[PDB]
Amino acid sequence: FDRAQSTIANVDPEIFAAIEQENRRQEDHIELIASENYTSPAVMAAQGSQLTNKYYVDVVEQLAIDRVKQLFGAEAANVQPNSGSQANQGVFFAMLKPGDTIMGMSLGSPVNMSGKWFNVVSYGLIDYDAAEKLANEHKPKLIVAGASAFALKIDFERLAKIAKSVGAYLMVDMAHYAGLIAAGVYPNPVPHADFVTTTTHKSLRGPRGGVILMKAEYEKPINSAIFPGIQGGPLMHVIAAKAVAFKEALSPEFKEYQQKVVENARVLAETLVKRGLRIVESHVMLVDLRAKHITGKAAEAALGAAHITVNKNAIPNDPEKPFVTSGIRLGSPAMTTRGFGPAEAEQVGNLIADVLENPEDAATIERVRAQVAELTKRFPVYR
Amino acid sequence: FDRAQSTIANVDPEIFAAIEQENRRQEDHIELIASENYTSPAVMAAQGSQLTNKYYVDVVEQLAIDRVKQLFGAEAANVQPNSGSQANQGVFFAMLKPGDTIMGMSLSGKWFNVVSYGLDIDYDAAEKLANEHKPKLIVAGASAFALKIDFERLAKIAKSVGAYLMVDMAHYAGLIAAGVYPNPVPHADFVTTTTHKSLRGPRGGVILMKAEYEKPINSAIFPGIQGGPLMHVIAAKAVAFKEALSPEFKEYQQKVVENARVLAETLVKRGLRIVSGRTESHVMLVDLRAKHITGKAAEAALGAAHITVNKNAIPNDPEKPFVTSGIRLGSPAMTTRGFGPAEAEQVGNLIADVLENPEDAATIERVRAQVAELTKRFPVYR
């Protein structure tokens, strides 16, 4: 908060100004990028604590491990990774040898994989027969699925059977869905997978970081490779922040929040459809913009000028170049965190359509900016 | 501070209590582990900021990069790693391929073939080993600074066998920034460091490199060093780098060196032997054999008296590795919280008092009370 940040103001005016600019950006924009969120003051205070000075499991780390195990029903957990990528790579580093074969189920999908360090084979997404055939041909040591497995409603039990039949581990990256899974909205892969990775930010609404969940059989292999003797001191301040976020996620309020996220996304989608858009039980949607004769890139820019943040995104059979696109992808987690409910979701849908219908018209952009300002003033992120 | 961490108190009493307990531990102990320090309120506030919500280079990251390049005269920098060891891995895995040979010089075999040169410096013998094993990369670390290795000469040896030269300066980076120790950057392909320790920043790492290596370092997928940055932590790094550029930081390092000199001289007056670190250093290794106490026993007894040190083997140590005949200790942390030469001398005598009667309850209690007077006078954070 104000007093704490004031400690930066006179020692480093440039960094103070950058922080203040970002605070303003977060307050003044309606953030609809589906991976984005606003973590709590408690989370931030934990990672702003004196735990940064700290270098036989620390109480803070045991709390984080115990809570994340509880949240997902996992047999074991490692909370040391500093990112989703570090979590995913950490599984490969721990469990595999150079040149081992990894089979990804993809739509960097489903995770980024190094062709220098591994033999990476991809199954394009479902056809369980074709996946099993490919697995038998390539004999992967590990099969990995990600966001697309959730979006496409993959049967994780069935996938686990396929992995086991060819002698492969099954890994699932649930980062894009972790908060919803914790709330029971989406199926939990943990009972079925050997490894489940996630970010601690995004729909889990925690600090930036990662976690590896694993069956107890793989606790030692994971922890014998992912520990301070090899990767150096973990960030115990960030681990404390993870613990705080996991306690929040265990609460009934968090379940209600995720239900509100789903409902707000439904209302937003329904409003866009009423306003003539096409939508290609979720927190995220892909909007086909072609009926409004605007590209994804132009829509992203125009919405941005109106203080509404989205990402351009290719649609299926997109007629535009991949750096142009015919779509935008947008989600409800962040607007829900700052207090928007169904009425506000519908307002946002209408503001979006207003911009798309006249994207470079100055008066339209000004009116929408003013309506956005009413919303952001009434629903501040941080008080 | 109190208002900020108060936001945790009712939402997560268990974590709040753990934080309070750690705050008390930092306050109530004299920390002499040479790698430990206390970073500034500004650094903490940066990494406690809303930058955690933020997902072309961000102004914050460009400031961090530019400042660390300025601090060390580096051609390029990557400020992404989250520990010293992770900075090191970020070089190995970006620049090498599976099975490549790394030659370490010092006092992961699944991934690389590691050969070790054991450390007056025998450059010919190091060169001979390098010619036999043809390492793709030679790494020097803390022992290279402690032993006064000639980095220009080591760079020539690396070139002569076809190896990159990497130097890990984590244990000396703050001294190097202040001009007290030689800077390896002009001579090495890669220089890695922690941002904490003697640089007194947030916990993290940095890779410094010659300009031609910026792209391969930044692009590596494996093992997940790159590819999801913590912009709040990067802002904290930037703050620490601005601090390190200041004349005040140089004065701090001069005080660190002086306090270590006083500590060492006091311990010698009390009948201890300094193996290494007696002059021009923040760190020293104490040979305890004259006091007939193991490093393990010394660490434990000093800990009971609220003085924190690490046991550490001495050269030719007769004790088991978990036991040892020495302790390693340093002045950075005590200097940060305001101790000067008078207090450094007092600390030296308190240490000796414990070493001389480690099993005597009255001695431990007496020293503990003296330690409490010092820690109360010299709080870490106000």
Side-chain angles (χ1 to χ4, degrees), chain A residues 215-223 225-260:
Chain A
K215 296 286 178 69
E217 181 185 351
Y218 308 120
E219 182 177 13
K220 181 70 180 174
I222 292 289
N223 287 345
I226 314 309
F227 82 112
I230 293 176
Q231 285 94 21
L235 304 182
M236 198 59 56
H237 48 303
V238 181
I239 293 171
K242 291 174 178 170
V244 174
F246 301 152
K247 183 161 183 303
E248 294 176 21
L250 284 163
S251 75
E253 291 86 356
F254 189 84
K255 187 173 181 179
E256 292 157 0
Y257 162 65
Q258 295 297 349
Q259 295 168 337
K260 194 175 183 178

Short mmCIF file of all heavy atoms in Angstrom, two decimals, chain A residues 215-260, unseen atoms left out:
data_model
loop_
_atom_site.label_atom_id
_atom_site.label_comp_id
_atom_site.label_asym_id
_atom_site.label_seq_id
_atom_site.Cartn_x
_atom_site.Cartn_y
_atom_site.Cartn_z
N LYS A 215 2.03 -38.00 -7.94
CA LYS A 215 1.78 -39.19 -7.15
C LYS A 215 2.95 -39.39 -6.18
O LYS A 215 4.08 -39.00 -6.48
CB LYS A 215 1.61 -40.40 -8.05
CG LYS A 215 0.40 -40.28 -8.96
CD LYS A 215 -0.90 -40.47 -8.17
CE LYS A 215 -2.14 -40.31 -9.04
NZ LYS A 215 -2.31 -41.39 -10.02
N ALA A 216 2.66 -40.00 -5.03
CA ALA A 216 3.64 -40.18 -3.97
C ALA A 216 4.85 -40.96 -4.44
O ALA A 216 5.95 -40.70 -3.98
CB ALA A 216 3.03 -40.87 -2.78
N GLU A 217 4.65 -41.88 -5.39
CA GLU A 217 5.73 -42.67 -5.97
C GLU A 217 6.79 -41.78 -6.61
O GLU A 217 7.96 -42.16 -6.68
CB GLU A 217 5.17 -43.64 -7.03
CG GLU A 217 6.21 -44.51 -7.67
CD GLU A 217 5.68 -45.38 -8.79
OE1 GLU A 217 4.43 -45.44 -8.96
OE2 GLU A 217 6.50 -46.00 -9.50
N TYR A 218 6.40 -40.59 -7.06
CA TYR A 218 7.33 -39.71 -7.74
C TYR A 218 7.77 -38.53 -6.91
O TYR A 218 8.46 -37.65 -7.41
CB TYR A 218 6.72 -39.24 -9.08
CG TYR A 218 6.24 -40.40 -9.91
CD1 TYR A 218 4.92 -40.53 -10.28
CD2 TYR A 218 7.13 -41.40 -10.30
CE1 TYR A 218 4.49 -41.62 -11.00
CE2 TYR A 218 6.71 -42.49 -11.03
CZ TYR A 218 5.38 -42.59 -11.40
OH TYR A 218 4.99 -43.69 -12.14
N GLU A 219 7.41 -38.53 -5.62
CA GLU A 219 7.80 -37.47 -4.72
C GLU A 219 9.32 -37.36 -4.64
O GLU A 219 9.87 -36.26 -4.83
CB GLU A 219 7.17 -37.69 -3.33
CG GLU A 219 7.45 -36.61 -2.30
CD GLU A 219 6.74 -36.88 -0.99
OE1 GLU A 219 6.23 -37.99 -0.79
OE2 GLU A 219 6.70 -35.96 -0.16
N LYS A 220 9.98 -38.48 -4.38
CA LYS A 220 11.43 -38.49 -4.25
C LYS A 220 12.13 -38.12 -5.58
O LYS A 220 12.97 -37.24 -5.59
CB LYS A 220 11.94 -39.82 -3.68
CG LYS A 220 13.45 -39.87 -3.51
CD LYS A 220 14.00 -38.97 -2.42
CE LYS A 220 15.51 -39.09 -2.34
NZ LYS A 220 16.09 -38.12 -1.38
N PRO A 221 11.75 -38.76 -6.71
CA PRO A 221 12.38 -38.31 -7.95
C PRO A 221 12.20 -36.81 -8.22
O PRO A 221 13.15 -36.16 -8.67
CB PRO A 221 11.62 -39.09 -9.03
CG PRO A 221 10.97 -40.22 -8.37
CD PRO A 221 10.88 -39.94 -6.90
N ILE A 222 11.02 -36.27 -7.96
CA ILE A 222 10.82 -34.84 -8.18
C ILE A 222 11.67 -34.00 -7.23
O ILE A 222 12.36 -33.13 -7.69
CB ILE A 222 9.31 -34.43 -8.11
CG1 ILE A 222 8.53 -35.02 -9.30
CG2 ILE A 222 9.15 -32.91 -8.00
CD1 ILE A 222 8.85 -34.38 -10.62
N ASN A 223 11.59 -34.35 -5.94
CA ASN A 223 12.27 -33.60 -4.86
C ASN A 223 13.76 -33.85 -4.81
O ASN A 223 14.50 -33.02 -4.28
CB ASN A 223 11.64 -33.91 -3.51
CG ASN A 223 10.28 -33.27 -3.35
OD1 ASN A 223 9.89 -32.36 -4.13
ND2 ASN A 223 9.52 -33.76 -2.38
N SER A 224 14.23 -34.95 -5.38
CA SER A 224 15.66 -35.23 -5.43
C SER A 224 16.34 -34.40 -6.53
O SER A 224 17.56 -34.30 -6.57
CB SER A 224 15.87 -36.72 -5.67
N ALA A 225 15.53 -33.84 -7.43
CA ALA A 225 16.01 -33.04 -8.59
C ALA A 225 15.57 -31.60 -8.43
O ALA A 225 16.26 -30.70 -8.84
CB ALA A 225 15.43 -33.62 -9.87
N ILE A 226 14.40 -31.37 -7.84
CA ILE A 226 13.86 -30.04 -7.65
C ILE A 226 13.99 -29.67 -6.16
O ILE A 226 13.07 -29.83 -5.38
CB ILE A 226 12.40 -29.95 -8.10
CG1 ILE A 226 12.18 -30.61 -9.49
CG2 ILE A 226 11.93 -28.51 -8.08
CD1 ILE A 226 13.09 -30.20 -10.61
N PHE A 227 15.18 -29.22 -5.77
CA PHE A 227 15.44 -28.85 -4.38
C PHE A 227 16.62 -27.88 -4.32
O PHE A 227 17.30 -27.69 -5.32
CB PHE A 227 15.67 -30.10 -3.52
CG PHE A 227 17.06 -30.66 -3.59
CD1 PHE A 227 17.89 -30.62 -2.47
CD2 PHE A 227 17.54 -31.25 -4.75
CE1 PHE A 227 19.17 -31.14 -2.51
CE2 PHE A 227 18.82 -31.77 -4.80
CZ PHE A 227 19.64 -31.71 -3.68
N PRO A 228 16.84 -27.22 -3.17
CA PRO A 228 17.81 -26.13 -3.14
C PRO A 228 19.26 -26.53 -3.43
O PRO A 228 20.04 -25.73 -3.93
CB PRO A 228 17.66 -25.59 -1.73
CG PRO A 228 16.25 -25.88 -1.38
CD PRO A 228 15.97 -27.22 -1.98
N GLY A 229 19.60 -27.78 -3.17
CA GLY A 229 20.94 -28.27 -3.49
C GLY A 229 21.28 -28.17 -4.97
O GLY A 229 22.46 -28.12 -5.33
N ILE A 230 20.27 -28.17 -5.83
CA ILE A 230 20.49 -28.03 -7.27
C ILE A 230 20.07 -26.66 -7.84
O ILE A 230 20.85 -26.01 -8.56
CB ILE A 230 19.81 -29.18 -8.05
CG1 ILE A 230 20.52 -30.50 -7.70
CG2 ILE A 230 19.84 -28.91 -9.55
CD1 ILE A 230 19.88 -31.71 -8.32
N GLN A 231 18.86 -26.21 -7.49
CA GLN A 231 18.34 -24.95 -8.02
C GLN A 231 18.60 -23.74 -7.15
O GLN A 231 18.20 -22.66 -7.52
CB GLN A 231 16.83 -25.03 -8.36
CG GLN A 231 16.55 -25.83 -9.62
CD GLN A 231 16.24 -27.26 -9.28
OE1 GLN A 231 15.87 -27.55 -8.14
NE2 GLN A 231 16.41 -28.16 -10.25
N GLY A 232 19.25 -23.92 -5.99
CA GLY A 232 19.52 -22.80 -5.09
C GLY A 232 18.32 -22.47 -4.23
O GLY A 232 17.27 -23.12 -4.33
N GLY A 233 18.46 -21.45 -3.39
CA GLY A 233 17.41 -21.09 -2.45
C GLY A 233 16.13 -20.72 -3.18
O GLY A 233 16.15 -19.87 -4.05
N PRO A 234 15.02 -21.39 -2.83
CA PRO A 234 13.73 -20.93 -3.29
C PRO A 234 13.38 -19.58 -2.73
O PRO A 234 14.04 -19.05 -1.85
CB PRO A 234 12.78 -21.99 -2.77
CG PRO A 234 13.44 -22.54 -1.58
CD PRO A 234 14.91 -22.31 -1.69
N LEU A 235 12.36 -19.00 -3.31
CA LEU A 235 11.89 -17.71 -2.89
C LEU A 235 10.87 -17.90 -1.76
O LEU A 235 9.69 -18.09 -2.02
CB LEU A 235 11.28 -16.96 -4.08
CG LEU A 235 12.14 -16.76 -5.34
CD1 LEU A 235 11.40 -15.94 -6.40
CD2 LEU A 235 13.44 -16.09 -4.98
N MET A 236 11.31 -17.90 -0.50
CA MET A 236 10.41 -18.29 0.58
C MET A 236 9.30 -17.25 0.79
O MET A 236 8.20 -17.62 1.22
CB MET A 236 11.16 -18.59 1.89
CG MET A 236 10.34 -19.40 2.91
SD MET A 236 9.75 -21.03 2.36
CE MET A 236 11.30 -21.78 1.88
N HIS A 237 9.57 -15.99 0.47
CA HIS A 237 8.55 -14.96 0.44
C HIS A 237 7.46 -15.27 -0.59
O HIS A 237 6.27 -15.08 -0.32
CB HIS A 237 9.16 -13.56 0.21
CG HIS A 237 10.14 -13.51 -0.92
ND1 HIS A 237 11.25 -14.32 -0.97
CD2 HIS A 237 10.21 -12.72 -2.03
CE1 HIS A 237 11.98 -14.01 -2.03
NE2 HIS A 237 11.34 -13.08 -2.71
N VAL A 238 7.84 -15.71 -1.79
CA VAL A 238 6.84 -16.11 -2.78
C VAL A 238 6.13 -17.41 -2.36
O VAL A 238 4.92 -17.54 -2.60
CB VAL A 238 7.46 -16.24 -4.18
CG1 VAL A 238 6.38 -16.63 -5.17
CG2 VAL A 238 8.16 -14.95 -4.59
N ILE A 239 6.84 -18.34 -1.73
CA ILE A 239 6.19 -19.55 -1.24
C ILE A 239 5.15 -19.20 -0.16
O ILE A 239 4.04 -19.78 -0.16
CB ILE A 239 7.20 -20.60 -0.73
CG1 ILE A 239 8.02 -21.10 -1.94
CG2 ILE A 239 6.51 -21.76 -0.03
CD1 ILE A 239 9.20 -21.98 -1.58
N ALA A 240 5.45 -18.25 0.71
CA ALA A 240 4.47 -17.77 1.69
C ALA A 240 3.24 -17.20 0.96
O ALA A 240 2.10 -17.45 1.36
CB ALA A 240 5.09 -16.73 2.59
N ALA A 241 3.48 -16.42 -0.09
CA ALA A 241 2.41 -15.85 -0.89
C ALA A 241 1.57 -16.94 -1.54
O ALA A 241 0.34 -16.82 -1.61
CB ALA A 241 2.97 -14.88 -1.90
N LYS A 242 2.22 -18.01 -2.02
CA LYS A 242 1.49 -19.16 -2.54
C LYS A 242 0.59 -19.76 -1.47
O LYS A 242 -0.59 -20.06 -1.73
CB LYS A 242 2.43 -20.23 -3.09
CG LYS A 242 3.16 -19.84 -4.35
CD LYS A 242 4.19 -20.87 -4.78
CE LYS A 242 4.87 -20.49 -6.06
NZ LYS A 242 6.05 -21.36 -6.38
N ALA A 243 1.13 -19.93 -0.27
CA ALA A 243 0.36 -20.50 0.83
C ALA A 243 -0.89 -19.67 1.11
O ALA A 243 -1.97 -20.23 1.33
CB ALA A 243 1.21 -20.61 2.08
N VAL A 244 -0.74 -18.35 1.13
CA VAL A 244 -1.87 -17.45 1.36
C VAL A 244 -2.92 -17.68 0.26
O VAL A 244 -4.11 -17.85 0.53
CB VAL A 244 -1.42 -15.97 1.38
CG1 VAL A 244 -2.63 -15.07 1.47
CG2 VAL A 244 -0.51 -15.73 2.57
N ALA A 245 -2.48 -17.73 -0.99
CA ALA A 245 -3.41 -17.91 -2.09
C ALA A 245 -4.11 -19.26 -2.00
O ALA A 245 -5.29 -19.38 -2.34
CB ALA A 245 -2.70 -17.80 -3.42
N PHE A 246 -3.42 -20.29 -1.53
CA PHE A 246 -4.04 -21.60 -1.42
C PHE A 246 -5.08 -21.61 -0.30
O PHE A 246 -6.14 -22.24 -0.44
CB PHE A 246 -3.01 -22.71 -1.20
CG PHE A 246 -1.96 -22.84 -2.30
CD1 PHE A 246 -0.72 -23.34 -1.98
CD2 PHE A 246 -2.22 -22.49 -3.60
CE1 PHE A 246 0.27 -23.46 -2.93
CE2 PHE A 246 -1.24 -22.58 -4.55
CZ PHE A 246 0.00 -23.09 -4.23
N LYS A 247 -4.79 -20.94 0.81
CA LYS A 247 -5.81 -20.79 1.86
C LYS A 247 -7.05 -20.06 1.33
O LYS A 247 -8.18 -20.47 1.61
CB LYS A 247 -5.25 -20.09 3.09
CG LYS A 247 -6.29 -19.99 4.21
CD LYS A 247 -5.68 -19.74 5.56
CE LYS A 247 -6.75 -19.72 6.65
NZ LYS A 247 -7.83 -18.71 6.44
N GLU A 248 -6.86 -19.01 0.56
CA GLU A 248 -7.98 -18.33 -0.05
C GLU A 248 -8.77 -19.29 -0.94
O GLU A 248 -9.99 -19.29 -0.95
CB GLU A 248 -7.52 -17.10 -0.85
CG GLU A 248 -6.91 -15.94 -0.05
CD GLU A 248 -6.38 -14.82 -0.91
OE1 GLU A 248 -6.81 -14.69 -2.08
OE2 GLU A 248 -5.59 -14.01 -0.41
N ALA A 249 -8.07 -20.09 -1.73
CA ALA A 249 -8.71 -20.98 -2.68
C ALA A 249 -9.50 -22.11 -2.00
O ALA A 249 -10.43 -22.67 -2.60
CB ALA A 249 -7.71 -21.55 -3.67
N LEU A 250 -9.12 -22.46 -0.77
CA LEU A 250 -9.81 -23.48 0.02
C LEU A 250 -11.15 -22.98 0.59
O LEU A 250 -11.94 -23.77 1.08
CB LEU A 250 -8.91 -24.00 1.12
CG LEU A 250 -7.81 -24.97 0.66
CD1 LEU A 250 -6.75 -25.08 1.74
CD2 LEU A 250 -8.39 -26.34 0.35
N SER A 251 -11.40 -21.69 0.50
CA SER A 251 -12.55 -21.08 1.16
C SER A 251 -13.82 -21.21 0.32
O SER A 251 -13.74 -21.28 -0.90
CB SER A 251 -12.27 -19.59 1.41
OG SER A 251 -12.35 -18.82 0.23
N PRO A 252 -15.00 -21.16 0.98
CA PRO A 252 -16.25 -21.16 0.20
C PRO A 252 -16.38 -19.94 -0.69
O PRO A 252 -17.00 -19.99 -1.75
CB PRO A 252 -17.36 -21.18 1.26
CG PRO A 252 -16.71 -20.91 2.55
CD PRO A 252 -15.27 -21.27 2.43
N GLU A 253 -15.78 -18.82 -0.28
CA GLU A 253 -15.83 -17.61 -1.08
C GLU A 253 -15.16 -17.83 -2.46
O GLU A 253 -15.58 -17.27 -3.45
CB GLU A 253 -15.20 -16.43 -0.33
CG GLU A 253 -16.00 -15.94 0.89
CD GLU A 253 -15.71 -16.69 2.18
OE1 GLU A 253 -14.93 -17.66 2.18
OE2 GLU A 253 -16.24 -16.27 3.21
N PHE A 254 -14.08 -18.61 -2.49
CA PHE A 254 -13.41 -18.87 -3.74
C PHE A 254 -14.25 -19.69 -4.70
O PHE A 254 -14.29 -19.43 -5.90
CB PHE A 254 -12.07 -19.55 -3.49
CG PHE A 254 -11.22 -19.67 -4.72
CD1 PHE A 254 -10.42 -18.62 -5.14
CD2 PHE A 254 -11.20 -20.86 -5.47
CE1 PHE A 254 -9.59 -18.75 -6.24
CE2 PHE A 254 -10.41 -20.97 -6.58
CZ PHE A 254 -9.59 -19.92 -6.97
N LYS A 255 -14.99 -20.65 -4.18
CA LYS A 255 -15.91 -21.43 -4.99
C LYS A 255 -17.01 -20.53 -5.57
O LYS A 255 -17.35 -20.62 -6.76
CB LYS A 255 -16.50 -22.57 -4.19
CG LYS A 255 -17.35 -23.52 -5.03
CD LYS A 255 -17.78 -24.73 -4.24
CE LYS A 255 -18.60 -25.68 -5.10
NZ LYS A 255 -19.02 -26.91 -4.35
N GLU A 256 -17.57 -19.65 -4.73
CA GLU A 256 -18.57 -18.69 -5.20
C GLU A 256 -17.98 -17.75 -6.26
O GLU A 256 -18.63 -17.43 -7.24
CB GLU A 256 -19.13 -17.92 -4.00
CG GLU A 256 -19.96 -18.79 -3.07
CD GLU A 256 -20.07 -18.27 -1.65
OE1 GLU A 256 -19.49 -17.20 -1.33
OE2 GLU A 256 -20.76 -18.94 -0.84
N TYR A 257 -16.74 -17.33 -6.08
CA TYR A 257 -16.07 -16.50 -7.06
C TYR A 257 -16.01 -17.22 -8.41
O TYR A 257 -16.36 -16.64 -9.45
CB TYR A 257 -14.65 -16.14 -6.58
CG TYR A 257 -13.74 -15.66 -7.68
CD1 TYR A 257 -13.99 -14.49 -8.36
CD2 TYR A 257 -12.63 -16.41 -8.05
CE1 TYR A 257 -13.14 -14.06 -9.38
CE2 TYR A 257 -11.80 -16.02 -9.08
CZ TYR A 257 -12.05 -14.84 -9.74
OH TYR A 257 -11.22 -14.46 -10.77
N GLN A 258 -15.58 -18.48 -8.41
CA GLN A 258 -15.48 -19.20 -9.70
C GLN A 258 -16.84 -19.41 -10.36
O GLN A 258 -16.96 -19.37 -11.58
CB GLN A 258 -14.75 -20.52 -9.54
CG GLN A 258 -13.29 -20.39 -9.14
CD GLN A 258 -12.42 -19.67 -10.16
OE1 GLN A 258 -12.83 -19.43 -11.30
NE2 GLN A 258 -11.21 -19.37 -9.76
N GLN A 259 -17.87 -19.64 -9.56
CA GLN A 259 -19.22 -19.70 -10.11
C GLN A 259 -19.63 -18.38 -10.74
O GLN A 259 -20.25 -18.36 -11.82
CB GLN A 259 -20.21 -20.19 -9.06
CG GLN A 259 -19.91 -21.63 -8.65
CD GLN A 259 -20.64 -22.10 -7.42
OE1 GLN A 259 -21.07 -21.30 -6.59
NE2 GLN A 259 -20.77 -23.40 -7.28
N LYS A 260 -19.23 -17.28 -10.12
CA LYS A 260 -19.54 -15.96 -10.64
C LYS A 260 -18.73 -15.69 -11.92
O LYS A 260 -19.22 -15.06 -12.87
CB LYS A 260 -19.25 -14.92 -9.55
CG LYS A 260 -19.82 -13.55 -9.83
CD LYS A 260 -19.59 -12.63 -8.64
CE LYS A 260 -20.23 -11.25 -8.85
NZ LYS A 260 -20.07 -10.33 -7.67
#
